[PDB]
Design a binder for this molecule. Structure first.
Ligand code: HEM
Ligand code: HEM
Ligand SMILES: C[C@H](O)[C@H](O)[C@H]1CNc2nc(N)[nH]c(=O)c2N1
Ligand SMILES: C[C@H](O)[C@H](O)[C@H]1CNc2nc(N)[nH]c(=O)c2N1
Ligand SMILES: NC(=[NH2+])NCCC[C@H](N)C(=O)O
Ligand SMILES: NC(=[NH2+])NCCC[C@H](N)C(=O)O
Ligand SMILES: [Gd]
Ligand SMILES: [Gd]
Ligand SMILES: [Zn+2]
Lengths: 401, 402
């Protein structure tokens, strides 16, 4: 078992949970690839039994009659149908475990608090839209954000998957210009072009909310416009720099990831969008300041009258901090849930402590957990971490086109 | 067959073919990644020596020459007769530069080809170690126009103990543990401070007392040596617009000189081989001054700046850290002591990655160490995928000699 040290406090733990790691990662004794973003009835039954055992253990009913009965039920379904169906309680447990097991999520202190919408009876893209709107309404809750996941029907043989083509439920369009530059969000140029291909009349703003492209099994994707009253946005202002508001920057309240696959007990849900609330560096540092995103850092530095002709003035650092201040100030002013990187990382340290007692460890991806500004000012920078794959899980999956 | 590596800022993709030549195992397995952990015979010696001699002759474009073959034969014969072998001076220089080039945790490797190598393999005593160390410091400091240097003491050999420098760096500030558990000075150096005291050093009582050297010659107890204060260049810290900052009485030293790592070249081990370059400002301004377990000055600075330290969302920590880093850069520049900011350094490292892709087909790099401890994603290295692996010649950690 790996020995894991916190360098701020000098405390030591052993991650015994890593010994249970299901699937293999990208590293070998010869080289580490930890910094890379994207590195049969019999097998299904094996995963299903592992999951059922896990669940019954969690509710303190291992080797109970109910446990053995459930195992028999699953064996019978698979033998008859080649697959099986989760009880609603198992779906809820599985979704929370997948969040709990996500090594790249710093917000996992909240894992036990998740609203799970069962959309496994969904039949049409039209109904997919209704479920998505209800999710957004619930999760947004007028700015008092609540964590939620909506689970669409599982993958099955001889039927296409349900898919949400958009990477998130709310995203800003990115429009390619004649010179090769982008107006709007460069991260979304591909999905923007697909929306246009499927009949969407594009705007030409910097913050146009994208329509949804929803795919019901074996159908071409269908285009749906989100009602603007459903999409809560926050205009950005700064508490002391009066000109900041004039920049016309804004962002949306609800981070709702919609392109990942949920795996539970060998079953796969290719459409299962989930949402929480934002950590401020996601917006202020990554979305607005990344050179391949909105890339506004230098615009802000010009407005602050910073010396941008020498790196050693640390103009980039100063401009970035004020942008993060503006995000935090603006979300709080607008009464929309947001957490700063210091509070989030402190809660994650608490989570690590909880998980050490509960499970003997916690899979975590250091490069993703440490915030993109002020890294070593947060306690997570000083914490050694072990990264491994546990199931239930959220997995990346190929784009449906 | 080879790891595919993407840069996310630019969208460019390369394959790290050099990784396939990795010479030792790291700590990761397909089951779990330990990349974030800080500290995770004749036939073998001959294989390592032949590989190194081959690297050398390739480096000078004389692969296959009569000189190349003669050296291979000579080394194999020497190992057979003596159990070990000796490097030629030119091989030592090449080997030290390669070890720097190979160091996955160093962001300053654009400079790898410019290294002054002092050959101290003739050293016979701790007194003589001290002479070599003093000369290294004087040369490398160069009145503030810093020059990268390494001094190589005699290699490990059977029948004889090692030369060792007990100190973790040539210049370090004492850390004096107080009764209540607190530390006056640098908490990172409490152990070496206590050992100096155990070995006859009369301690000071300041926050910035330069430690003496504990130098160990083979099969001898360590001996204590005081550095002439005129030899240790220091920089008082002030801030260009926060006038009270100077009154904190902070200072740092010019020369970062790591002295506790082992240099490995062609199977030969040099347990004493201190090296020095120049500082990147975040090492001082962010880590040394702001780590909670180091000087820990962040809150006091923030309060003097009149920041709201009552809630985290004002980002008082971030604002104060940036100004401390500004003070470090301003002060070193004012004192005319070489220093590099994290933006300039990471940009130069990206150039180094490019050079190395063409030259060797890859570059071993430890992402967690390369990305600076403030403003990570504002630097290009944050967006660059990296492959971490071990090549030799190398600088390696080694157990403390006590
Ligand atoms: C409740 C407040 C939450 C906070 C503050 C939070 C925070 C974060 C942050 C900062 C990231 C890094 C994202 C990035 O850099 O792109 C992340 C990733 C992630 N989160 Fe959480 N999160 C929350 C809720 C959730 C929920 C409800 C789920 C699932 C049920 C979840 C699952 C994940 C997954 C799978 C990732 C990895 C995404 C990827 O690989 O691109 N998170 N989270
Ligand atoms: C010339 C200017 C140089 C700069 C700007 C530079 C920069 C850095 C930085 C910022 C680190 C991280 C240190 C830490 O966080 O503790 C580092 C580590 C390292 N550097 Fe360089 N360096 C320079 C010269 C050198 C030289 C001359 C050598 C050897 C000949 C070297 C070899 C190493 C090694 C082996 C490490 C790893 C240290 C450890 O693991 O504790 N560097 N360097
Ligand atoms: C190359 C590197 O792995 C990549 O830039 C990562 C670094 N850490 C990250 N961390 C988070 N939270 N989100 C990210 O998108 C990234 N990007
Ligand atoms: C636990 C973690 O590996 C540790 O804090 C590392 C992170 N990255 C680092 N990076 C550098 N350059 N120097 C360090 O000391 C560290 N410390
Ligand atoms: N806090 C979250 N749940 N984040 C999910 C990822 C959101 C993504 N980083 C974004 O900036 O939109
Ligand atoms: N730039 C260097 N060569 N650094 C070597 C390590 C110095 C160490 N980080 C310090 O703060 O003293
Ligand atoms: Gd102006
Ligand atoms: Gd002032
Ligand atoms: Zn790894």
């Amino acid at each position: 078992f790996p020995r894991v040290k916190n360098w701020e406090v000098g405390s030591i733990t052993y991650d015994t949970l890593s010994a249970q790691a299901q699937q293999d990662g990208p590293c070998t004794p010869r080289r580490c690839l930890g910094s890379l973003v994207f590195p049969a009835p019999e097998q299904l039954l094996s995963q299903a039994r592992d999951f059922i055992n896990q669940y019954y253990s969690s509710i303190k009913r291992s080797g109970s009659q109910a446990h053995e009965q459930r195992l028999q039920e699953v064996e019978a379904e698979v033998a008859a149908t080649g697959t099986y169906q989760l009880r609603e309680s198992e779906l809820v447990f599985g979704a929370k475990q997948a969040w709990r097991n996500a090594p790249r999520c710093v917000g996992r202190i909240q894992w036990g608090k998740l609203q799970v919408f069962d959309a496994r009876d969904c039949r049409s893209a039209q109904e997919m839209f209704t479920y998505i709107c209800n999710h957004i309404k619930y999760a947004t809750n007028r700015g008092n954000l609540r964590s939620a996941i909506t689970v669409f029907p599982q993958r099955c043989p001889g039927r296409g998957d349900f898919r949400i083509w958009n990477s998130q439920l709310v995203r800003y369009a990115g429009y390619r210009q004649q010179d090769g530059s982008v107006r709007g969000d460069p991260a979304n140029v591909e999905i923007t072009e697909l929306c246009i291909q499927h009949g969407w009349t594009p705007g030409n703003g910097r913050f146009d909310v994208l329509p949804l492209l929803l795919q019901a099994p074996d159908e071409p994707p269908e285009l749906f416009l989100l009602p603007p009253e459903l999409v809560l946005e926050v205009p950005l202002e700064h508490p002391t720099l009066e000109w900041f508001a004039a920049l016309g920057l804004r962002w949306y309240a609800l981070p709702a990831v919609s392109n990942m696959l949920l795996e539970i007990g060998g079953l796969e849900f290719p459409a299962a969008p989930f949402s929480g609330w934002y950590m401020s560096t996601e917006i202020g540092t990554r979305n607005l300041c990344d050179p391949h995103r909105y890339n506004i850092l230098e615009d802000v530095a010009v407005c602050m009258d910073l010396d941008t002709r020498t790196t050693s003035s640390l103009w980039k650092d100063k401009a970035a901090v004020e942008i993060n201040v503006a995000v935090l100030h603006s979300y709080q002013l607008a009464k929309v849930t947001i957490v700063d990187h210091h509070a989030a990382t402190a809660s994650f340290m608490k989570h690590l402590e909880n998980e050490q007692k509960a499970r003997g460890g916690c899979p975590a991806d250091w490069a993703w957990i440490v915030p993109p500004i002020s890294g070593s000012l947060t306690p997570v920078f000083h914490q050694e971490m072990v990264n491994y794959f546990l199931s239930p899980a959220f997995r990346y999956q190929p784009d449906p086109w």
